[PDB]
Amino acid sequence: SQQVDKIKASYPLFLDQDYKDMLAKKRDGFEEKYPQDKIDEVFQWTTTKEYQELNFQREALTVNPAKACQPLGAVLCALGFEKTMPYVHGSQGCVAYFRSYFNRHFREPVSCVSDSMTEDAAVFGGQQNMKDGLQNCKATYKPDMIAVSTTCMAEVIGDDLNAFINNSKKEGFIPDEFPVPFAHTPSFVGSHVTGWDNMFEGIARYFTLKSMDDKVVGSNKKINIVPGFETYLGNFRVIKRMLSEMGVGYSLLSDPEEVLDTPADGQFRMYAGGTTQEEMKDAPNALNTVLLQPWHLEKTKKFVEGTWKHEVPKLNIPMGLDWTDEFLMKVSEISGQPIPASLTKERGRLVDMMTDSHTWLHGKRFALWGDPDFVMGLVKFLLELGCEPVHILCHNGNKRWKKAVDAILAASPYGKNATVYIGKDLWHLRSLVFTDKPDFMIGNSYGKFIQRDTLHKGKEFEVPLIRIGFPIFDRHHLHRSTTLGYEGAMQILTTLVNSILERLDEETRGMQATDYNHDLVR
């Protein structure tokens, strides 16, 4: 039943008495459900150390992974270039999933096409699909460039992208001068960041490999910036703003900030901004190239050092105080531009906030997960703040990255109780937060379920989640945040300290029970 003046959606409509009676009769009559005592016993068992030992012995089963497949990153990289259509050679369900997944994260239109390969292509290949798809896409959506990646279908059947695109050009399906860079992005290798790296290397090789004769290093007096797989617009904004404040010529490559932040003014803009083809063609003339996320830009680094002959600096992701200072000093050394007083003041203001919030931040225990560069930057910043990272998980990390993170942890007394896990999923992390309870989790929206599970054990066992990372589906406009530079560190510090204070208010709100510590001033 509904009251017209105050209508109820599913919550709390289904908390009505008639609905509860219906559900009870359904369960008791036809669900053949295990008795509630058995369910409670098994749940309590899954929070134990023995269950954790069984859980970490897994070899074939993955439960609740924290990574995606390569073509998603390939599409994100392709979206960062001017008037470029991401084209995914293979099956169409992949593109539907990629588009919906980016739409839920960014809450913006995401343009991507496929050639819709079917069972026939599984035995004959996808030549005809490639020809017709390139012709159709160029005719319909009018791109200046089409960037081609692959699904696992095409990778398994061994489709030759280079031959397919060349045959499409020689038979008149697309003009010979139309730029069609391509990359193989097998989903059974690496993850989405690997796809981003492959797509970027393919684009760079397409535009620079065959024209290196006239290129002179440092002749355009700019520095190339390669951001990598990035899902915070504020990171692109802050990098450009910092570079502009120093008065340093730069060429951001694969930046999608404009096309992922188009205004609502009565028209749909399929394309907006992006790296131009001229910038990519002139990139070898830059002074040097900086990779913002070196741990998933390895192939790009090999290409840039081997072909462009740039001495790529050994820099960490510019996250937190020390790493941002190293990035600013390296940029100053490369470009010859001194660090301006505005950035000095911004750094001082971040230090002031650190000193203001240090008492509430000190000693707090965090579990955390995400992509390798983001995870290590966050761990570095947490150590700088006096916090204790306890469980560090990176499902798509490798052994060298784990060694680097271990070296970072050993350099601080606050890393004594930290353990780094690679190849582990969020079910492993659920066991970790049950058996060795931290104070907070830091990660994407998939962590909310973990929080729910801990609250089922009890209020005193609940581990709150802080949403930093990708993807975030259950909050609005967090993709506008910044996590890079002094401005990025300021936002992260504010979010952390206020999460701590909000939890403290929640714990001391009980009248005449805990509200003696419900202080007005914190």
């Binding site: 039943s1 509904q2 289904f14 539907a96 819709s116 279908m153 398994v156």
Partner: protein, 477 residues
């Protein structure tokens, strides 16, 4: 009403395409005529999508794992293959359920084999067996396993049926192999077909020899309702208030025992024809169980469906049906009186695919709203046969519409509201046209039944008459 102008619009939109794509797409666009009963003479459906035109369709894995098998709460579903597939479909569809997640229910979890290069090169049958053992170790209260195949499973030479049989014999557990590789078929509909075939071949006949279930003449089963935002519960409450007993519901909030008990019911009430007609016809042929379609979108269709369903039974059920209708009449009358004046005369263009586009029109008409264009992602000719008499004269019909086509149609027709999926929402919000997600109900609902009609009317009013739509043009421009 401007029927020639609609055909002219179709031609101008088709002008952009190359010759082959234009010739293919011309058959998928029609001007509605309610008189025509055979939709094949005007519109062509269930065909492969043209390459590179940004289709909205999904794959067979989405139609099987995402739609049919996923809502089964007490079973564990293994996305067999590389990691992306299950990650993108994890908890994306709001098929509601009651349970303790991770203990006895596993709907929002993502179980996968997560292939690497070596699994592609040497196969993954031994890995699948080891995975099944690990699942049995870590989730002891599961009541069955399904293995949903992704593209490489079909491409490389894996034989999951033998592994399923061997492990099921070893463990006395139901293991259902589903060959739902995404490259099979042209859309999610083949996924529906494959999932229903797996249901008949591995689950439906477990209790054929069993007669320990006590049956009543009022035994019915809800088929093809996936409880999106609680829809199936709002339907089931009305069915039980009519005096019937709902033994099973497929598949939202569904359990494997309910599926096994279904062959004992007296009537099958099919909500989604497109995804479950296969198993409905199979049950009619094998068990002699009649099945009938019903509609619970809006008060008019709900009352008609309740009366038709009660007509299949005796006079006591008809009396209870009259009592239910009389009881709920003032509530939906109040909803109409409050919300119809603010939605009267508005025009809507909806693309959902499947069954929803012709199946929610009555609810819009209950609020004085006119549907001027409708279309499907993956429907068949019989769906369009129902749609043509469901829609009005000189309206636009469209199958597997492309992004360019739909944007041009919306620009020309200029509706007051559009109902579609997440991949059109932001495109049309930037165009300044109110948009309602119809697959997810915009994370609201339910909309089925009398309780859902109030939520539906409130949501349409709040989006259509939103003050934000009057502010996209800057005052200085």
């Amino acid at each position: 009403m401007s029927r020639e102008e609609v055909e002219s619009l179709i031609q101008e939109v088709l002008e952009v395409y190359p010759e082959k794509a234009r010739k293919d797409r011309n058959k998928h666009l029609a001007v509605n005529d309610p008189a025509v009963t055979q939709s094949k003479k005007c519109i062509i459906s269930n065909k492969k999508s043209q390459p590179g035109l940004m289709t909205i369709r999904g794959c067979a894995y989405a139609g099987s794992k995402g739609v049919v098998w996923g809502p089964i709460k007490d079973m564990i579903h293994i996305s067999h293959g590389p990691v992306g597939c299950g990650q993108y479909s994890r908890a994306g569809r709001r098929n509601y359920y009651i349970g303790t997640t991770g203990v006895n229910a596993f709907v929002t979890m993502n179980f996968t084999s997560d292939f690497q290069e070596k699994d592609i090169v040497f196969g993954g049958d031994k890995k699948l067996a080891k995975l099944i053992d690990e699942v049995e170790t870590l989730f002891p209260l599961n009541k069955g396993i399904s293995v949903q195949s992704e593209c490489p499973i079909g491409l490389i030479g894996d034989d999951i049926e033998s592994v399923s049989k061997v492990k099921g014999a070893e463990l006395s557990k139901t293991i259902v192999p589903v060959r739902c590789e995404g490259f099979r078929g042209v859309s999610q509909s083949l996924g529906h077909h494959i999932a229903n075939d797996a249901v008949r071949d591995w689950v439906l006949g477990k209790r054929d020899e069993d007669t320990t279930f006590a049956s009543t003449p009022y035994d019915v089963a809800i088929i093809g309702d996936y409880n999106i935002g609680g829809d199936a519960w709002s339907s089931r409450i009305l069915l039980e208030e009519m005096g019937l007993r709902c033994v099973a519901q497929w598949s939202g909030d569904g359990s494997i025992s309910e599926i096994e008990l279904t062959p004992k019911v007296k009537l099958n009430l099919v909500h989604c024809y497109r995804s479950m007609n296969y198993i409905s016809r199979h049950m009619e042929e094998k068990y002699g169980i009649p099945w009938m379609e019903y509609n619970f979108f809006g008060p008019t269709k709900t009352i008609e469906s309740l009366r038709a369903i009660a007509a299949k039974f005796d006079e006591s059920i008809q009396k209870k049906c009259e009592e239910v209708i009389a009881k709920y009449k003032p509530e939906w009358e109040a909803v109409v009186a409050k919300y119809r004046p603010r939605l009267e005369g508005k025009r809507v263009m909806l693309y959902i695919g499947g069954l929803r586009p012709r199946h929610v029109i009555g609810a819009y008409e209950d609020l004085g709203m006119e549907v001027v264009g409708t279309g499907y992602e993956f429907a068949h000719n019989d769906d369009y046969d129902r749609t043509m008499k469901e829609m009005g004269d000189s309206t636009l019909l469209y199958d597997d519409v492309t992004g360019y086509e739909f944007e041009e149609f919306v620009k020309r027709i200029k509706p007051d509201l559009i109902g579609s999926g997440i991949k059109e929402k932001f495109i049309f919000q930037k165009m300044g046209i109110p948009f309602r997600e119809m697959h997810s109900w915009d994370y609201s609902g339910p909309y089925h039944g009398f309780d859902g009609f109030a939520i539906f009317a409130r949501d349409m009013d709040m989006t259509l008459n939103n003050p934000c739509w009057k502010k996209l043009q800057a005052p200085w421009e």
